């Protein structure tokens, strides 16, 4: 199903984008902990 083949690719693009949301959040979370730990010394 070559249409579904081009469909499937366009599907995976959304998964790849979904994860990119998720790790963006964790990146900032880690940066918040760093800022705290500096103030912890």
């Amino acid at each position: 199903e070559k249409a579904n083949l081009i469909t499937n690719a366009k599907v995976h693009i959304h998964k790849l984008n979904l994860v990119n949301r998720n790790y963006t959040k964790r990146a900032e979370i880690s940066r918040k902990n760093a800022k705290i730990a500096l103030r912890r010394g």
Partner: protein, 55 residues
């Protein structure tokens, strides 16, 4: 009975069902923003200056 509560308030299951909900929540909300994707076409196909005369 504490055993029977702890079987089904198991923190192994509380944390599972809480993580699952959050993924579906961000899946749906972003699937609402691509459901409002057309402003990018409206702002693009119409750029009409001429009505500054009409203004």
């Amino acid at each position: 009975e504490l055993k029977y509560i702890a079987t089904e308030a198991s923190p192994a299951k509380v944390a599972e069902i809480a993580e699952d909900s959050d993924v579906y929540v961000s899946e749906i909300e972003e699937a609402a923003d691509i459901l409002a994707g057309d402003p990018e076409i409206d702002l693009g196909i119409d750029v009409t200056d001429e009505l500054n005369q009409l203004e």
